[PDB]
């Protein structure tokens, strides 16, 4: 401990057994350190040794397909503090795809300040569930330990004791010959020695002497001359949030490695410079810079690799590239966007530039500031440029904004089928590689074949939108040859969005969201166009045309490509209010409710509605009883490509024939109630009569200022509730009693009409006799002013009276007593 070794710059270990004994004399690592793709080395080649000569690294670590590694103590048996200022994957530790390893070497690493832990994509790796992520760093709800085979605790792990401190999983451990340092969870990241407690109290990762701040290898508050004060006092400044160092020392630190350099800023002596500040080497301080400025960036060892989609290597603002670059990003299916995700903020590439699997882009417009290449550092094979897998690239860069020049470097144009050779020669002349006689490896037997770079735009000669169709015609176009034309290809889809793409929705035979129509070549004239065949009213649509033409064996395209237009269909008469229901709410008031129409046709201004009263016929009263790319399937999928191949062969067949003939043939010389409901689904009316039917017209409107346009009418016939009590017998029930068994009865008509009255129930009874019912018809009542009893029995009779209508049913009025005598 106490940093007993020399400070070395960044390094890497790759493909040999001689490079596995380098870090043994380096105690401070300034730069990147990686171990990846060891296939030339074998399992027993590796050796095992423990050395306490490493205490810090100042950059990310990356393990990748290391074949033959049996322990991680061989090269890191003393690493205690890990943090970096330059990120890669945004993580500080990156174990990507390692295998043939069965134990770690970091039972001392418990201080993590910058970056997180990424344990994912790890096959055949044991000891991933015998590590306390709450001990090494913050709790596990902030670390993505997923996508592995140790999420289910595969493998058996033996940890001494089952020395090991108090704690598949039995105890925590990292190696079979060394135990993990474990202490209470509350410490979190403070580290600890094996005492079952945080090392001193507020240290960080580990400390030489427990209970002493002086020995904290790192603590939680900036360390200054033997203390861990909250902030650093002047002239000292912060340092990676674990140290206090002054200006002269902030300088001498980086000057000693002469690596990484630190500069005072924000009271932060850290290895960074704000946006756009280049260095001046008198003190290696951050100095202002204008224009493009690569500021701080690590490029040591004349090269740098990019094997991630996001890192703090090309987003810092390092435009000028002094090193090399190699892209090996794993996964995905488009290196276009993968490349863009790393060099999105850099527009001038002064280093090794290359592109692969070109897709989703047909022209480069992200390298519009590159105008010079230094080439001071030698590139692999002295080549500064390569081209490969460019199968969607249709254009190179402009020559009045780019102005590139090469002072060192070579060109390699291979496997560029879609690009035309004109742009290639442009590269050769603007870059000026051939102009210096430098050797270039060119392969045009694979380039300038099946290419097209002619993108001429066509315009719509005439347009006529309707509310359910759209007519479109475009200027007559003829390629260099009149015969070379197979029609046009109008492509369209509905699009209210002001940002839509054409790649999703086509190029398949099971689904088609971008409907495609074809058009016969024009008369040799006549304007070729297209007319919609019905569309939803009040909708916005994206439309464009692309000319289809016969291609030669040379595979040359004279095509034309019109642009996309946004044409919006017009409105039409509203639809009917969905689910119209008219139901009574009282006897004098009925209500109407509905749902908005099926097809609104733009903004609604009101609802046209009418209503009228329906009465009851008098006859009712006088009656008595006395693969896929988009949702769903297609309806316009395209013809099979083999069919196209054959029709093309037949076309060119007849063509070759025509030419053969031309050759052999020629030889050279020797009123109604109405209501208006403005944007509401309810309706209420009042001033109606008990048990009365009402019919109500109903429509929906969307515009009423220059015309009256509304949905078709609808009708519902409903009747307010009936008043059952309104049928009770009222009116003086007058009796005319005689001694001859004759009693003239007089009861009056029920209070309310209550619609049709079927009859009057006269129940004249006696107590000890049979009950005698009488059905008083309309005629009988109206003619008898009630009723009369023709023949009777002696005794005091009683006649309950209840009129019968059909509004529900009345109640038997008081029994009216009449003492019959004879």
């Amino acid at each position: 401990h106490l940093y007993p070794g020399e400070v070395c710059p960044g390094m890497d270990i790759r493909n040999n057994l001689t490079r596995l004994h380098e870090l043994e004399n380096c105690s401070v690592i300034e730069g990147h350190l990686q171990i990846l793709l060891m296939f030339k080395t074998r399992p027993e080649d590796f050796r095992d040794l423990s050395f306490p000569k490493l205490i810090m690294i100042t950059d990310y670590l990356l393990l990748f397909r290391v074949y033959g590694l049996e322990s991680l103590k061989d090269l890191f048996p003393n690493l205690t503090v890990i943090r970096g200022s330059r990120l890669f994957f945004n993580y500080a530790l990156v174990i990507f795809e390692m295998v043939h390893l069965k134990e770690l070497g970091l039972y001392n690493l418990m201080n993590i300040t910058r970056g997180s832990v990424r344990i994912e994509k790890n096959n055949e790796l044991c000891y991933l569930a015998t590590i306390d992520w709450s001990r090494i760093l913050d709790s596990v709800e902030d670390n993505y330990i997923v996508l592995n085979k140790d999420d289910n605790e595969e493998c058996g792990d033996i940890c001494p004791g089952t020395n090991c401190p108090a704690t598949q999983f039995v105890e925590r451990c990292w190696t079979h010959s060394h135990c993990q340092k474990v202490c209470p969870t509350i410490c979190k990241s403070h580290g600890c020695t094996a005492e079952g407690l945080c090392c001193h109290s507020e240290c960080l990762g580990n400390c030489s002497q427990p209970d002493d701040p002086t020995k904290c290898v790192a603590c939680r508050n900036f360390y200054l001359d033997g203390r861990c004060v909250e902030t650093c006092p002047p002239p000292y400044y912060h340092f990676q949030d674990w140290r206090c160092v002054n200006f002269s020392f902030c300088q001498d630190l980086h000057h000693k490695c002469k690596c990484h350099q630190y500069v005072i800023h924000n009271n932060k002596c850290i290895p960074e410079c704000p946006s756009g500040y280049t260095m001046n080497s008198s003190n290696l301080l951050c100095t202002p810079c204008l224009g493009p400025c690569p500021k701080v960036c690590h490029l040591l060892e004349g090269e740098k690799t990019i094997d991630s989609v996001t890192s703090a290597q090309e987003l810092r603002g390092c435009t000028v590239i002094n090193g090399s670059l190699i892209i090996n990003i794993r996964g995905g299916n488009n290196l276009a966007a993968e490349l863009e995700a790393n060099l999105g903020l850099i527009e001038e590439i002064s280093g090794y530039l290359k592109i692969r699997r070109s897709y989703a882009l047909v022209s480069l417009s992200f390298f519009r500031k590159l105008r010079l290449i230094r080439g001071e550092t030698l590139e692999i094979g002295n080549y500064s440029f390569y081209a490969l897998d460019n199968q969607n690239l249709r254009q190179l860069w402009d020559w009045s904004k780019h102005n590139l020049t090469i002072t060192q470097g070579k060109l390699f144009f291979h496997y560029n089928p879609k690009l035309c050779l004109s742009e290639i020669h442009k590269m050769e002349e603007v870059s000026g590689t051939k102009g210096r006689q430098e050797r270039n490896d060119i392969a045009l037997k694979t380039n300038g074949d099946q290419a097209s770079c002619e993108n001429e735009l066509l315009k719509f000669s005439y347009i006529r939108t309707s509310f359910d169709k759209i007519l479109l015609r475009w200027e007559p176009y003829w390629p260099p040859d009149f015969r070379d034309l197979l029609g046009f290809m109008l492509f369209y889809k509905e699009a209210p969005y002001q940002n839509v793409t054409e790649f999703d929705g086509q190029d398949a035979c099971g689904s088609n969201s971008w409907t495609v129509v074809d058009i016969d070549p024009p008369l040799r004239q006549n304007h070729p166009g297209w007319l919609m065949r019905g569309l939803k009213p009040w909708t916005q649509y994206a439309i464009f045309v692309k000319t289809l033409v016969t291609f030669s064996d040379e595979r040359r395209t004279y095509g034309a490509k019109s642009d996309i237009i946004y044409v919006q269909t017009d409105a039409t008469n509203p639809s009917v209010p969905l689910d119209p229901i008219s139901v009574s709410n009282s006897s004098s008031q009925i209500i109407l409710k509905w749902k908005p129409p099926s097809d609104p046709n733009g903004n609604i201004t009101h609802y046209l509605v009418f209503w009228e009263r329906q009465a009851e016929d008098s006859e009712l009263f006088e009656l008595d009883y006395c693969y896929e790319d988009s949702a769903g399937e297609c309806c316009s999928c395209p013809k099979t490509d083999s069919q196209i191949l054959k029709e093309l062969e037949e076309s060119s067949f007849r063509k070759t024939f025509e030419d053969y003939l031309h050759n052999v043939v020629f030889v050279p010389r020797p009123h109604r109630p109405f209501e208006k409901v403005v944007n509401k689904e309810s309706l209420v009316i009042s001033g109606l009569r008990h048990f009365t039917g009402y019919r109500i017209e109903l429509q929906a409107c969307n515009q009423d200022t220059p015309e009256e346009r509304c949905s078709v009418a609808a009708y519902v016939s409903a009747r307010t509730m009936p008043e059952a009590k309104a049928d009770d017998i009222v009116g003086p029930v007058t009796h005319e009693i005689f001694e001859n068994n004759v009693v003239h009865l007089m009861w009056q008509e029920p209070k309310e009409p209550n619609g049709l009255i079927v009859l009057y129930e006269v129940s004249y009874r006696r107590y000890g006799d049979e009950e005698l019912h009488l059905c008083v018809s309309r005629k009988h009542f109206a003619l008898e002013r009630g009723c009369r009893l023709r023949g009777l029995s002696p005794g005091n009779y009683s006649v309950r009276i209840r009129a019968t209508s059909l509004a529900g049913n009345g109640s038997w009025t008081e029994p009216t007593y009449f003492y019959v005598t004879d």
């Binding site: 031309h662 020629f666 010389r669």
Partner: peptide, 21 residues
């Protein structure tokens, strides 16, 4: 080959007059 010269570039009258004698 008249079609190999007039369907590649617009032939002038001399190049057309050629195949009449």
């Amino acid at each position: 080959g008249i079609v190999e010269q007039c369907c590649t570039s617009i032939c002038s009258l001399y190049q057309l007059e050629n195949y009449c004698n």
